[PDB]
Symmetry: D4
């Protein structure tokens, strides 16, 4: 399985607002397209104003396929503007599970 | 629940060796002390020679308690030298799960 | 004892304004909740527009408890918006005192 | 008062060794020259293998004066080699105390 | 041959807008002055909101010459304001092709 | 098309040695597996001791497939040790070509 | 002699405006207070939108003295707002000349 | 005029050794090839174990020409190994002087 880890640094103080709108209007739409959400966290100790969420994909072409459909969803497009200015810097990475990882 | 995310950058080319000794001699000892391993990953696309593992703790004082016992385990101390020089740079952070996170 | 070190990078030229409102409306409220302020500094030589303050906690669960109360304080919530846009980037870390540290 | 903050990133796993030799052979020599040690900490949560110590100076020329005598102390010179290879990366910065800082 | 690699970090969510106006109003003007465009990419996995484009120059004085003319082009100056606020951080570097590089 | 950009920071002064052994023993083996090499560069102005090479893949699952075969090649495994210690830090990213990119 | 190196990252595209107002209204005021300007540069190849200027001081307490007077100059205070929002991130450092440095 | 700024981070504690061998065996050879040394500094406050030297070039092709000759000098090649392992990380950048820069 492939694990995508996305890390965002939000505008200082935007985490509460971000998590509210995501919970209320984005996460369900996103999960119906992307598949398996592994974890969704916000900072406590370390980088402040940070969001980290992990998604698992069977293959990377499947990921491309799923993300393409998510991006086409007009409901997703209507949602994006609600967090588009809350996120200042972002990046994502693909990782693989160790043989001894619960996540496989 | 508290989530600790540890990220290491290993010596270039050390991931295979690192994952083998961890699987063979460290992970079980570590899991018997720390409790719940959420995920253990190695790089594929993004930062190279990277290890990322996540652990969940009921409270931070419980984390402190568990890590103190792990550090006292002479089996742990016998193991550490096997990855101590494979890891070049490291850092860890504590995060909290979003209400809509599978991980809670 | 636990030492929390928070480092912020403010909007260029915001330190004077920041330090004035903190002194006038935030530090006392914060101290009555958080406990022991170890030091509060602003840059001179090195990173510019930087704020660094250190707080000591008996335990991390006590820290969590104290910060929860501070976050619940409506006076704190009325103050936050006064520095919320003055801070651009932030992060915090927990450290422990060396046996030979005055700070223990 | 001026506050100098020195931050070092040590070789992975070198904190115990570092703190022991500093306590046993360096800190007293250093304190007799530099004056006031404000705090000496090692990482717990955040950057790993990190040392952070803070020194207060009445003036920066006094700091220069004090550090020149410390560097001239042959006992200091005999000590340095004991942590010179334990430290990988380092940096220091000068800051000033806020009017509401305990540290002034 | 010299290869210049320019990397920009755009405002979160600005890639589509940026790529549209560049395609519609800037790339042709830029190519007629700079010479050979080697590649123009936007992020997918790794740093998000990133643009990376590569240009080849026979010599660095030739590069200077070409960029001077591009900067003098009033059509270029009329275009710049259209992406000037879409780019947050940028940097460029000059590199040389390996003997076994297709790009020479 | 997908473009993978790999950037390495080598041991200070290792570029000549690195480029020689790659040219002599690694690049051909690598190209026979990976497919299309877009460019292979070493620093001149900017980050020093840096290597940047770009590879194009039709799909990411094809990339996975090709890299799996490359990693299985015992000739590749015999070569790796020759640059494994010349590379200090590394990272890779996947990007897409702009519609106006020669590289598509 | 002491050399202070200040490095700023300006808003994308602000260098021309910055350099004009500094030349027209700030540099002379600043030089009459600070003493010896060693060099004032703006980026070309490397970090973009960057300003780097170097000032030489006989002693650090002299630097403190001179900068205090510059900060007190009402003409300086009237000027500051003109570049205060053009500069996004900044930092400064003190260095010493090598015995073989023209700058001593 | 073009200004090249080279910044190196040396092995912890290597500055004295580095500066000695450069003064004794490298700087003169280097100056006879490169032309005008603007300044050569080592850290005091800020990044520790850092070297920063600045060279001025009439044109970038002239710089290429001069550095090619320096690299061909067998005396330079005999010297390089003496600082090659003292330098851990490096980078250089080209900048231009402001109209009001003493350095033009």
């Amino acid at each position: 399985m492939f694990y995508e880890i996305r890390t965002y640094r939000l505008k200082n103080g935007a985490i509460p607002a971000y998590l509210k709108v995501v919970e209320d209007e984005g996460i369900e739409i996103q999960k119906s397209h992307l598949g398996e959400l592994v974890g969704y966290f916000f900072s406590e100790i370390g980088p402040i104003n940070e969001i980290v969420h992990i998604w698992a994909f069977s293959s990377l072409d499947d990921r491309a396929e799923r993300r393409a459909r998510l991006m086409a969803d007009p409901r997703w497009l209507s949602f994006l503007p609600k967090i588009r200015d809350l996120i200042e810097v972002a990046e994502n990475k693909i990782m693989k599970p160790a043989r001894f990882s619960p996540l496989m």
